[PDB]
Design a protein around this ligand. Structure first.
Ligand SMILES: Cc1cc2nc3c(=O)[nH]c(=O)nc-3n(C[C@H](O)[C@H](O)[C@H](O)COP(=O)(O)OP(=O)(O)OC[C@H]3O[C@@H](n4cnc5c(N)ncnc54)[C@H](O)[C@@H]3O)c2cc1C
Length: 498
């Protein structure tokens, strides 16, 4: 029942932490509520694609859903399903829906693989207490290398039909005096070229991403987690969800963990104790565990900052209708490669990802996922009645985000004589999706709810390592920052505490 170190979750913060702990000789147990995705399903594949969604696509839902922005073309493939331990979870709060991965590797299993370093000037603005030289000289480079970030071949990108959708938006943005930038990725671009050449099994070129990629994507299970297990000091137990956390009579930590099967049936409740406890359950998971512990009195010394400072990384989705002479293509790589960088740290800052659409036929639609600078923050409040942390965030709090996104795309529409699509997110004439989030950030902010390295305030040997540490915004796709920060944190923690 005892293990020196326990890491809750297997996402970015968790993976980095477990690898370094293992390398330092600390026997570590990782607890993951989702599945280890390595068994072929009904179609001979581990994951289901976006055009053939089944129970594997969702975390305990009774019906599949179309990827945001593609309901008009993909609802036709939606089917009723048995609640199952699927890979993608849509967590619905009062006025916000947060998408998170569930499985060994966490969000790395379902994300777009976009590996982007935040602008240094912005990093220094959001985390002034952190030494930025150390982050850019050592931690970002280390994260880049271990994550296996790579770059797309420009010649191939320019010629391939699979990225015509990206080229169309580049041309359109150019007329408004806006340039584009290549987005590094963990998806093997060399493999992607071979897919287009019909030399290897297609994944990104076979409408796969949001429910996992059967090939090509260097998710954490192949990188950090593989290395962690390789140390001989790390083990991973799946379908194990931590419910409570308390401090033992001697300073260690005890956890109640529920083991379930893939159908969600409770198989057993175990008691696991440790000397060092690392939380890597994500922005939602780690914050909920802490607000629960504080409010139920199992960790009575947690401060008032626990639960505060949450932000959706200013996530806003919108789309533009192209002229008939600017078709985006029926064949679109599921992995984005280009983005529009209009981020100058001001309130009008927008870094938008040119997103592909899975329809498989010509729709003339250009889809974009904008990351904005919105000061609004939400707070996770514990509800003792349902034993769930509720996110206090209202839709109108995304107004500044919508405004920033709209001002940028209005410029592109004006320069091209194009208009927005208003029917992609429902039948209510909404050109901007403002109640979804792929990048949850905050809840246990670094330096507020914890010290500058993630040590939870009020406790010893208790650490938070994931996206809950970030103060609601990074101005870019978040995983590289979470990874780099985790490298910085665990290295210091092992040196001084272990
Ligand atoms: C569709 C989609 C697209 C995205 N695209 C990108 C992109 O291209 N680039 C980018 O930078 N970011 C992207 N992201 C966001 C990125 O995936 C997340 O920011 C990142 O995965 C967060 O890492 P984390 O370590 O905080 O937590 P997560 O990766 O979320 O991992 C948390 C893990 O903890 C497990 N866990 C939860 N609670 C418990 C519990 N109580 N007990 C046990 N285990 C638990 C979860 O099941 C999970 O496996 C996207 C996310 C989604 C949903």
């Amino acid at each position: 029942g005892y293990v020196p170190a326990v890491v809750i979750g297997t996402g970015y913060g968790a993976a980095v932490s477990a690898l370094r702990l293992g390398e330092a000789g600390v026997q570590t147990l990782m607890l993951e509520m989702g599945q280890l995705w390595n068994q072929p399903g009904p179609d001979g594949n581990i994951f289901c694609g976006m055009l053939n969604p089944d129970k594997r696509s969702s975390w305990f839902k009774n019906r599949t859903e179309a990827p945001l922005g593609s309901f008009l073309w993909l609802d036709v493939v939606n089917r009723n399903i048995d609640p199952y331990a699927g890979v993608l979870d849509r967590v619905n709060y009062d006025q916000m829906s947060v998408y998170v991965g569930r499985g060994v590797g966490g969000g790395s299993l379902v994300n777009g693989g976009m590996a982007v370093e935040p602008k240094r000037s912005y990093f220094e603005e959001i985390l002034p207490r952190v030494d930025s030289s150390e982050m850019y000289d050592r931690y970002f480079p280390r994260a880049n290398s271990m994550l296996r970030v790579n770059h797309i071949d420009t010649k191939w990108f320019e010629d391939t039909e699979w990225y015509k959708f990206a080229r169309v938006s580049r041309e359109q943005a150019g007329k408004a005096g806006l340039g584009t930038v290549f987005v590094p990725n963990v998806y093997d671009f060399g493999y992607m070229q071979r897919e287009a050449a019909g030399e290897v099994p297609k994944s990104a070129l076979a409408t796969e991403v949001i429910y996992g990629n059967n090939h090509g994507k260097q998710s954490l299970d192949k990188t950090y987690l593989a290395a962690a297990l390789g140390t001989g000091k790390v083990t991973i137990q799946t379908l194990h969800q931590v419910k409570t956390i308390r401090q033992t009579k001697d300073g260690g930590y005890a956890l109640t963990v529920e083991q379930k099967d893939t159908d969600g049936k409770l198989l057993a409740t175990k008691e696991i104790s440790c000397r060092y406890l690392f939380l890597g359950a994500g922005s939602l998971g780690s914050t909920e565990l802490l607000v629960r512990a504080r409010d139920t009195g199992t960790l009575p010394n947690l401060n008032s900052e626990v639960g505060a400072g949450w932000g959706p990384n200013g996530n806003i989705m919108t789309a533009r209708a192209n002229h008939m002479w600017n078709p985006t293509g029926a064949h679109q790589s599921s992995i984005p490669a280009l983005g529009i960088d209009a981020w100058d740290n001001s309130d009008s800052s927008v870094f938008a990802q040119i997103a592909p659409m899975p329809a498989g036929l010509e729709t003339w639609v250009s889809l974009y996922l904008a990351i904005t600078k919105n000061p609004q923050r939400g707070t996770f409040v514990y509800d003792a009645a349902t034993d769930r942390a509720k996110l206090n965030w209202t839709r109108d709090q995304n107004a500044p985000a919508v405004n920033a996104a709209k001002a940028l795309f209005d410029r592109i529409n004006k320069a091209n004589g194009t208009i927005y699509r208003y029917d992609l997110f429902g039948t209510q004439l909404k050109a901007f999706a403002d109640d979804f989030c792929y990048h949850p950030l905050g809840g246990c902010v670094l330096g507020k709810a914890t010290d500058d390295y993630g040590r939870v305030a009020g406790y010893k040997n208790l650490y938070v390592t994931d996206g809950s540490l970030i103060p609601g915004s990074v101005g870019v796709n978040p995983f590289v920052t979470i990874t780099a920060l985790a490298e910085r944190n665990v290295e210091r923690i092992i040196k001084q505490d272990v």
